[PDB]
Design an enzyme around this catalytic site. Structure first.
Site, PDB file in Angstrom:
ATOM      1  N   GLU A  25       0.732  -1.757  -0.091  1.00  0.00           N
ATOM      2  CA  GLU A  25      -0.227  -0.297   0.124  1.00  0.00           C
ATOM      3  C   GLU A  25       0.705   1.228   0.040  1.00  0.00           C
ATOM      4  OE1 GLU A  25      -2.293   0.204   3.179  1.00  0.00           O
ATOM      5  OE2 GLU A  25      -3.721   1.646   2.024  1.00  0.00           O
ATOM      6  N   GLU A  60       5.973   7.920  -3.266  1.00  0.00           N
ATOM      7  CA  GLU A  60       6.045   7.438  -2.256  1.00  0.00           C
ATOM      8  C   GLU A  60       7.650   6.493  -2.194  1.00  0.00           C
ATOM      9  OE1 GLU A  60       2.615   6.425   0.962  1.00  0.00           O
ATOM     10  OE2 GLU A  60       1.996   8.185  -0.046  1.00  0.00           O
TER      11      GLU A  60
HETATM   12  N1  LIG Z   1       0.584   4.810   1.809  1.00  0.00           N
HETATM   13  C1  LIG Z   1       0.000   5.555   1.681  1.00  0.00           C
HETATM   14  N2  LIG Z   1       0.003   6.817   0.856  1.00  0.00           N
HETATM   15  C2  LIG Z   1      -0.412   7.222   1.254  1.00  0.00           C
HETATM   16  C3  LIG Z   1      -0.461   8.872   0.759  1.00  0.00           C
HETATM   17  C4  LIG Z   1      -2.193   9.377   0.923  1.00  0.00           C
HETATM   18  C5  LIG Z   1      -2.274  10.697   0.494  1.00  0.00           C
HETATM   19  N3  LIG Z   1      -2.249  11.940   1.359  1.00  0.00           N
HETATM   20  C6  LIG Z   1      -1.062  12.942   1.151  1.00  0.00           C
HETATM   21  O1  LIG Z   1       0.077  12.143  -0.156  1.00  0.00           O
HETATM   22  C7  LIG Z   1      -1.415  13.689   2.242  1.00  0.00           C
HETATM   23  C8  LIG Z   1      -0.569  14.921   2.897  1.00  0.00           C
HETATM   24  C9  LIG Z   1      -0.916  15.151   4.340  1.00  0.00           C
HETATM   25  F1  LIG Z   1       0.007  16.359   4.639  1.00  0.00           F
HETATM   26  C10 LIG Z   1      -1.981  15.070   4.246  1.00  0.00           C
HETATM   27  C11 LIG Z   1      -3.141  14.383   4.010  1.00  0.00           C
HETATM   28  C12 LIG Z   1      -2.896  13.372   3.028  1.00  0.00           C
HETATM   29  C13 LIG Z   1      -3.498  12.769   2.040  1.00  0.00           C
HETATM   30  C14 LIG Z   1      -4.152  11.400   2.778  1.00  0.00           C
HETATM   31  C15 LIG Z   1      -5.110  11.677   3.164  1.00  0.00           C
HETATM   32  N4  LIG Z   1      -5.486  12.492   2.190  1.00  0.00           N
HETATM   33  C16 LIG Z   1      -7.131  12.588   1.699  1.00  0.00           C
HETATM   34  C17 LIG Z   1      -8.029  13.461   2.447  1.00  0.00           C
HETATM   35  C18 LIG Z   1      -7.175  14.018   3.337  1.00  0.00           C
HETATM   36  C19 LIG Z   1      -8.126  14.870   4.478  1.00  0.00           C
HETATM   37  C20 LIG Z   1      -9.309  14.684   3.954  1.00  0.00           C
HETATM   38  F2  LIG Z   1     -10.433  15.631   4.762  1.00  0.00           F
HETATM   39  C21 LIG Z   1     -10.409  14.082   2.609  1.00  0.00           C
HETATM   40  C22 LIG Z   1      -9.260  13.066   2.513  1.00  0.00           C
HETATM   41  C23 LIG Z   1      -4.209  13.040   1.520  1.00  0.00           C
HETATM   42  O2  LIG Z   1      -4.835  13.330   0.418  1.00  0.00           O
HETATM   43  N5  LIG Z   1      -2.860   8.446   1.250  1.00  0.00           N
HETATM   44  C24 LIG Z   1      -1.661   7.411   1.445  1.00  0.00           C
HETATM   45  C25 LIG Z   1      -2.563   6.232   1.612  1.00  0.00           C
HETATM   46  C26 LIG Z   1      -1.584   5.125   1.909  1.00  0.00           C
HETATM   47  F3  LIG Z   1      -1.989   3.621   2.456  1.00  0.00           F
HETATM   48  C1  LIG Z   2      -0.434   1.598   5.686  1.00  0.00           C
HETATM   49  S1  LIG Z   2       1.147   2.789   4.761  1.00  0.00           S
HETATM   50  C2  LIG Z   2       2.388   2.393   4.640  1.00  0.00           C
HETATM   51  C3  LIG Z   2       3.235   1.643   5.315  1.00  0.00           C
HETATM   52  O1  LIG Z   2       4.742   1.298   4.924  1.00  0.00           O
HETATM   53  C4  LIG Z   2       5.874   1.311   5.490  1.00  0.00           C
HETATM   54  N1  LIG Z   2       6.691   1.257   4.648  1.00  0.00           N
HETATM   55  C5  LIG Z   2       7.529   1.930   3.353  1.00  0.00           C
HETATM   56  N2  LIG Z   2       8.283   1.528   3.503  1.00  0.00           N
HETATM   57  C6  LIG Z   2       9.109   0.450   4.283  1.00  0.00           C
HETATM   58  C7  LIG Z   2       9.743  -0.454   4.193  1.00  0.00           C
HETATM   59  N3  LIG Z   2      11.185   0.376   3.232  1.00  0.00           N
HETATM   60  N4  LIG Z   2       9.671  -1.546   4.820  1.00  0.00           N
HETATM   61  C8  LIG Z   2       8.363  -1.703   5.142  1.00  0.00           C
HETATM   62  N5  LIG Z   2       7.653  -0.863   5.833  1.00  0.00           N
HETATM   63  C9  LIG Z   2       7.726   0.020   5.069  1.00  0.00           C
HETATM   64  C10 LIG Z   2       5.461   2.091   6.059  1.00  0.00           C
HETATM   65  O2  LIG Z   2       5.635   2.788   7.552  1.00  0.00           O
HETATM   66  C11 LIG Z   2       3.679   2.536   5.956  1.00  0.00           C
HETATM   67  O3  LIG Z   2       2.930   2.198   7.296  1.00  0.00           O
END
Ligand SMILES: Nc1nc2cc(CN3C(=O)c4cc(F)ccc4[C@]34CCN(Cc3ccc(F)cc3)C4=O)[nH]c2cc1F
Ligand SMILES: CSC[C@H]1O[C@@H](n2cnc3c(N)ncnc32)[C@H](O)[C@@H]1O
Ligand SMILES: Nc1nc2cc(CN3C(=O)c4cc(F)ccc4[C@]34CCN(Cc3ccc(F)cc3)C4=O)[nH]c2cc1F
Ligand SMILES: CSC[C@H]1O[C@@H](n2cnc3c(N)ncnc32)[C@H](O)[C@@H]1O
Lengths: 303, 318, 307, 318
Positions: B116, B125
């Site tokens: 994820e 990421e």
């Molecule tokens: N590994 C993951 N990476 C990611 C990367 C994201 C996106 N993300 C940011 O980068 C980010 C940076 C910020 F400072 C603040 C928030 C975000 C988000 C996470 C939530 N949100 C939507 C939202 C927020 C507020 C809302 F009221 C409604 C909706 C984004 O825009 N969501 C993931 C989920 C995973 F599992």
């Molecule tokens: C559920 S959001 C993605 C998750 O992956 C984890 N993660 C990101 N990169 C790595 C990595 N190289 N090894 C293990 N976990 C990771 C982050 O700590 C976060 O909890």
């Protein structure tokens, strides 16, 4: 067996009584619930299995330290800031709470019963040391002598008014409640564990945080040896006429020393912190250790 | 933080897709006659507080197939959540590992790996680098979920957002650093000048010898109106398994999902664009041993400066 | 009226603990994040590879509960300035771990002790944590009015208490604070949780803390006297101090066990409320001023500018 | 650069000591009866333009012992110099390797490793980390040259140098960043307030389990004059083999050598010091996976702020 379904991971204490029933204290230092428990094993080798226990009970909070009060009584140093007394019933199956007084303002970390057997002394993370009466169930005196957390307290075996104490203020205090100023300081690294000599009323040993075990006389000139690589948690003498000293530490090892602080036995059996040791009264060459790895190991000491 | 994981978990559409994705993959890999002979080795890479672990459990139950779960997570604060769950709920079926996936020495190879690790620009990421480093403990016939993801770009005119970025100037750094870094933003008061086009794509498991995650992409956006370009909105699509997908691309946006806002790549100076003219943007994905970053430049109808050279203003930490 | 919290170093069930504390009228709860006695190894095997969870789950409370109702506490075994190199290194790793977990939960505050002179490595680790990531979490430094060594009972035969008037020596706990915050370079995240003792020091020692960022005032249960009715009260010395502290608008924390066993634990708080209501009310000056406390504003220039 | 290596090579005293150091070690490891049976495996780690390779050749000839040389060098520009020399002069006795010593997979273990990875504060070029990573391909009875090095500190009063550092303020960074970073400087117009004391020591090969190169050192400097502290001059000593040493510590300074000027750790604010007072300084060597840095603070007679926390102002790249 009329007891809790499961005991906690971290075994804190282990003591033998006259006949040879192994007392066990245990705390949960991880997870949702941070409580403690008390257990009895008429079969030492059955430990720490909950299905094969004589007695068992769940306490309110964790068990920091305990000690055998005769054959029936159990004295507890609780995290709640309370000294708890429990008493085995006549059948010795249940464990009912005798008293539970919240007097300490912080975790009670050490407790020891005095010669008389109607009195005991406790040491807490709060600086206070308190003298108890088990009959009236009240605090006789309260002493703020140290300037840090009280680590260990140890009652003199044959003297009621005398007991040792040590704290993180780097003070080893020898007490005597008959004097107006009872405490007396005994002249680098913090003292962690204490142990009176069983045959000599003027001799004691102390383990420090740096792992050194020391041999001290009341008169004065001291002997020592680097036994462990980490803090020494406890020191327990054997029941022999010429005693052996069992030392236990956070380096996950056990060492048995002679009179001249020379290493006889070594045991890297535990994988976690070794918390307590207790010599079998029936077989003096046997020694039972408990640790946070949830093991109850029985060592054959070459004597 | 805890509440960052909380808001991730408050998106049931995403995990239902992950549940469905794994569900199908289990049926494809394990036939009906090998239902209780074959136990599939799943490995959630980046388990967080364990929404996927749960989804993998649900997916295995609706499929009625046996699984063995690992839960690799580097964040030690989250691992506290995992182990408490694991002790209470999951049990020995889930093996919580507290490690980096690039480092972890696996005691067993996986049939499926589930991740994820995708941001708003997919690979922002460093999902490519992490899954490349975790690739060795995948079976030769192993599956990755997601198996593919792509990033999209579209030019935008927003005098509001331009003026917003402008106001992110901070003491003790470059006066124009704010223009050379992407932002996650709910784009509202803006104008999309052209239709989104694909930028960078990644496939897992990567089977290209000497796997390179550096890229260079030229896009030409036909504009049909007079306007003033202020930046580039970024989206992404991902293929979890087959027909199971997630997307924040407006035209193919997954309905209801709100786990990713769009990303915004600004430019230092606005660029006027006449009707009929083509906006030509160039995007690099760059890296060294320590960092990954993007650079970008407009080349038509007029040239901009190259933004974020050497990741001076913005880097993504390895 | 008054904002009050509860200090505990024993929490067997986090959900049940809060309920009791909240029922007694407390606004927040100071408690450990890892079990106080749960000492952890980070270098030497095999104790470093200890299995199982290291503490409670964050799921046991809601995000909002962590953010408003909980104050973290550094575990007592953590000693970053220890003379023993092993204990130092271990305490470093443990301190970061606990501080990081505090930030993970999103705690509004976190307590660290100043119970000795040298807190240099403590300051070095905290400063590093402050400059790692971004957080608004405050750090309350637990510092006593009177050092533990200076309020101990004179009951050691061969080590009597200093019966000499040492003007500079009685101000030592302020110097502990001063040095710490200087090392940390006057971080706005670092504030004082002033611990009040049984015997208050000389007046000068108290005046030392004027102009310092006092956010909390820790009150032990031991310092409370008992009245004819048989309920907790304070001396006229302590009353004047609390009156001064109410002007600063600090948050009063209660610590220690219930020495007044016959009464409820609310009685302690009810007394602070009793004091809060019973003060000289704000005059026209302080009525209007309420809001602009230590708020910097530029001097008006009605010649150069048009008002 | 080329001319940076040039000025290193223009110090004949240093290499004569390296020559003598290796010369003795060859005689100790190889007896007279095993003169033409035993070929010693030498490995110059960081060969540069090859002054040590040459010195190792001279040392083997004056000793009259057989050697097999490797020349590990990461800088590819210098490797061009090595290979041209190797083709023309050295031959197949020297095997030029173009790699990092921490990465390089050795086809053979070394009897001796020779390095020149020391700066003005000894470990400021991360000699500890490099030689730790190169330690695996040393024989169990293998030697390192240098086998040990130590850094020294001494408090200094210089209103000139303080005012010099002050003037290193640059745009687009912290206003006081210049005070939180060491400088190499020929200290001239200054006053040494106390005698140098040892700060950090390193031994190679390191045989301490879980080798940690993080450190924390408290020093107390007795001052016998009124003054104003402005910083701390840094020196170093190194033991190449046994009685073969190099040093820039004023009292034990190697005569004629000019390959290292002293280093200067400034402080933000000057500190007044009365006669009889002790200057107490604290020095940390800190690291993460990417960087190494120093922090420092004065604790007596008054406290300073901790300088360079988290390496914000100064890091050394891994
Ligand atoms: N590994 C993951 N990476 C990611 C990367 C994201 C996106 N993300 C940011 O980068 C980010 C940076 C910020 F400072 C603040 C928030 C975000 C988000 C996470 C939530 N949100 C939507 C939202 C927020 C507020 C809302 F009221 C409604 C909706 C984004 O825009 N969501 C993931 C989920 C995973 F599992
Ligand atoms: C559920 S959001 C993605 C998750 O992956 C984890 N993660 C990101 N990169 C790595 C990595 N190289 N090894 C293990 N976990 C990771 C982050 O700590 C976060 O909890
Ligand atoms: N690995 C090595 N590292 C090192 C590290 C050093 C010292 N050093 C710097 O750090 C440095 C930094 C600079 F910006 C400029 C110069 C230096 C020197 C190298 C030369 N020199 C002396 C000098 C200069 C000029 C002069 F007219 C007389 C004498 C230093 O002071 N010398 C090594 C030699 C190795 F083999
Ligand atoms: C002669 S000055 C030291 C030399 O060591 C080289 N060097 C420094 N670190 C390493 C390393 N890790 N591996 C190989 N060479 C190195 C530098 O490039 C320089 O030429």
């Amino acid at each position: 067996p009329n007891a809790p379904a499961c005991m906690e991971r971290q075994l804190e204490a282990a003591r033998y009584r006259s006949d040879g029933a192994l007392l066990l204290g245990a705390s949960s230092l991880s997870g949702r619930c941070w409580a403690g428990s008390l257990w009895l094993f008429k079969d030492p080798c059955a430990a720490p299995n909950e299905g094969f226990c004589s007695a068992g009970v769940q306490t309110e909070a964790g068990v920091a330290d305990l000690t055998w009060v005769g054959e029936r009584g159990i004295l507890v140093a609780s995290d709640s800031g309370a000294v708890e007394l429990w008493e085995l019933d006549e059948n010795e199956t249940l464990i009912v709470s005798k008293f539970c007084k919240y007097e300490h303002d912080d975790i009670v970390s050490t407790v020891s019963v005095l010669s008389s057997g109607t009195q005991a002394v406790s040491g807490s993370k709060d600086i206070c040391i308190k003298v108890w009466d088990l009959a009236q169930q009240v605090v006789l005196s309260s002493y703020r002598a140290h300037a840090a957390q009280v680590t260990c307290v140890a009652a003199s075996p044959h003297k009621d008014s005398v007991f040792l104490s040590c704290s993180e203020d780097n003070r080893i205090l020898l007490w005597d409640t008959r004097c107006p100023k009872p405490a007396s300081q005994i002249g680098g690294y913090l003292p962690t564990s204490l142990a009176w000599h069983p045959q000599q009323s003027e001799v004691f040993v102390f383990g420090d945080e740096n792992g050194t075990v020391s041999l001290v006389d009341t008169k004065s000139c001291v002997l020592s040896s680097a036994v462990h690589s980490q803090c020494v948690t406890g020191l327990v003498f054997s029941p022999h006429s010429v005693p052996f000293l069992a030392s236990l530490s956070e380096d996950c090892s056990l060492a048995v020393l002679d009179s001249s602080l020379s290493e006889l036995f070594r045991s890297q059996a535990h994988r976690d912190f070794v918390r307590d040791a207790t010599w079998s009264p029936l077989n003096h060459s046997l020694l039972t250790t408990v640790g946070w790895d949830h093991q109850v190991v029985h060592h054959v000491v070459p004597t | 933080e805890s509440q960052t994981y909380e808001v991730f978990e408050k998106d049931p559409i995403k995990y239902s897709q992950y549940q469905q994705a794994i569900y199908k993959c289990l049926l494809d890999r394990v036939p009906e006659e090998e239902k209780d002979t074959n136990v599939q080795v799943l490995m959630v890479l980046g388990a967080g507080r364990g929404p996927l672990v749960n989804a993998s459990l649900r997916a295995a139950k609706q499929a009625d197939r046996r699984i063995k779960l690992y839960a690799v997570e580097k964040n030690p604060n989250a691992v506290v959540t995992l182990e408490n769950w694991q002790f209470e709920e999951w049990g020995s079926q889930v093996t919580v590992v507290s490690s980096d996936m690039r480092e972890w020495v696996a005691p067993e190879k996986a049939d499926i790996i589930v991740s994820e690790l995708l941001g708003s620009f997919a690979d922002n990421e460093l999902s490519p680098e992490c899954l490349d480093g975790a690739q060795h403990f995948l079976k030769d016939d192993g599956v990755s979920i997601p198996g593919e993801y792509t990033s999209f770009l579209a030019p935008i005119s927003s005098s509001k957002l331009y003026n917003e970025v402008r106001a992110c100037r901070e003491k003790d750094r470059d006066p124009e650093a704010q223009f050379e870094m992407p932002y996650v933003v709910r784009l509202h008061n803006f104008h999309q000048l052209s239709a989104p086009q694909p930028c960078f794509t990644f496939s897992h498991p990567n089977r290209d010898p000497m796997i390179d995650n550096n890229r260079y992409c030229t896009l030409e956006f036909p504009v049909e109106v007079n306007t003033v370009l202020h930046g580039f909105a970024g989206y992404f699509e991902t293929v979890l398994y087959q027909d199971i997908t997630l997307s924040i691309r407006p035209e193919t946006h997954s309905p209801g999902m709100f786990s990713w806002f769009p990303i915004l790549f600004p430019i230092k100076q606005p660029i006027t664009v006449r009707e009929g003219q083509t906006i030509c943007v160039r995007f690099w994905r760059c890296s060294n041993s320590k960092k990954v970053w993007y650079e970008w430049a407009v080349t038509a109808p007029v040239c901009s400066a190259i933004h974020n050279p050497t990741g001076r203003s913005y880097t993504i930490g390895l | 009226r008054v904002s009050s919290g509860r200090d505990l170093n024993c929490v067997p069930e986090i959900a049940d603990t809060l309920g009791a504390v909240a029922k007694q009228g407390f606004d927040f709860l100071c408690m450990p994040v890892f079990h106080p006695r749960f000492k952890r190894e980070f270098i030497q095997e095999p104790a470093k590879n200890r299995p199982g969870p290291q503490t409670r789950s964050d799921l046991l409370l809601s995000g909002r509960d962590w953010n408003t109702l909980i104050v973290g506490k550094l575990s007592p075994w953590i000693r970053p300035d220890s003379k023993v190199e092993k204990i130092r290194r271990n305490s470093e790793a443990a301190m970061l771990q606990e501080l990081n977990f505090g930030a993970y939960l999103g705690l509004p505050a976190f307590l660290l002790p100043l119970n000795q002179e040298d807190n240099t490595n403590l300051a070095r680790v905290l400063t590093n944590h402050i400059h790692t990531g971004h957080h608004s979490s405050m750090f309350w430094m637990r510092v006593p009015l009177v050092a533990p060594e200076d309020l101990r009972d004179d009951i050691i035969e061969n080590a009597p208490t200093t019966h000499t008037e040492e003007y500079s020596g009685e101000e030592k706990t302020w110097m502990w604070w001063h040095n710490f915050r200087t090392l940390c370079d006057y971080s706005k995240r670092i504030a004082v949780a002033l611990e009040i003792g049984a015997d208050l020091p000389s007046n000068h020692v108290i005046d030392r803390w004027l102009g310092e960022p006092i956010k909390a005032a820790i009150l032990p249960t031991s310092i409370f006297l008992t009245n004819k009715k048989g309920f907790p009260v304070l001396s006229k010395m302590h009353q004047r101090l609390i009156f001064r502290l109410l002007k600063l608008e600090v948050q009063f924390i209660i610590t220690g066990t219930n020495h007044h066993s016959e009464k409820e634990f609310c009685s302690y708080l009810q007394y602070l409320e009793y004091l809060s209501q019973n003060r000289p009310p704000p005059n026209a000056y302080e009525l209007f001023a309420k809001g602009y406390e230590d708020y910097l504003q530029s001097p008006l220039q009605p010649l150069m500018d048009n008002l």
